[PDB]
C-alpha cells in the first residue's frame, strides 16, 4: 500500500520563470520517482507564476529531496515545503508530565532535524515541571514532519505535538 498521495506532494516556490514541466521534473527525478511535475502559469499568457508542484512515489523520497536542499534550478535557488501537514521552526510538546527531562526529548526528536533550543517549562513560582515543552529546529521541514505524524511517544508518554508561533 502506497503513502497516501497528499504527503508525497512538495510545493516549490521561487522558480525561474524559465523553469518547464520538464526541467522541473529533470532536476527533482535525481532524488526519486515523481508521479506528478508541474509549474503553475497564468491561464491566458502561459507566464510562470514561479512555482510548481512535484509528487513523489514514496515519502522517503520527499525526505531524500528535502535533505538534499538547497535545490538550484535553473540557476535559481528554490523554495520546497510539503504542501499538505495538517512555515516555523519550533513545537510545543504537551503530555510529558514532571519525570520527561531535556535529554528525553533530544533523543527522541534529533532525528526530525537539528534542534537549537530545548525549553522545558517550569512553574514560575514553585520550578515545578509543568509537563510541556518547546523544541526549537533550525529548519521548517523538521516541524513539517513532526506534525504530520500521528502519534509521538517520548519518555513513554503519549504526546500532544503542535506549531508553535
Ligand atoms: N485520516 C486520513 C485522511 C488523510 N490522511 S493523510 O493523508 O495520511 C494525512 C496525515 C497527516 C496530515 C495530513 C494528511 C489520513
Known sequence: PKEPEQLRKLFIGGLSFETTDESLRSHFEQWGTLTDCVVMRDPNTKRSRGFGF???????????????????????????????????????????????????????????????????????GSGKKRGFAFVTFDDHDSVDKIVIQKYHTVNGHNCEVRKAL
Open 54 to 124: 512535484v509528487t513523489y512515489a514514496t515519502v522517503e523520497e520527499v525526505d531524500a529531496a528535502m535533505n538534499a536542499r538547497p535545490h538550484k534550478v535553473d540557476g535559481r535557488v528554490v523554495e520546497p515545503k510539503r504542501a499538505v501537514s495538517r512555515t516555523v521552526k519550533k513545537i510545543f510538546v504537551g503530555g510529558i508530565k514532571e519525570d520527561t527531562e531535556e535529554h528525553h526529548l533530544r533523543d527522541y526528536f534529533e532525528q526530525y532535524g537539528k534542534i537549537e533550543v530545548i525549553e522545558i517549562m517550569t512553574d514560575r
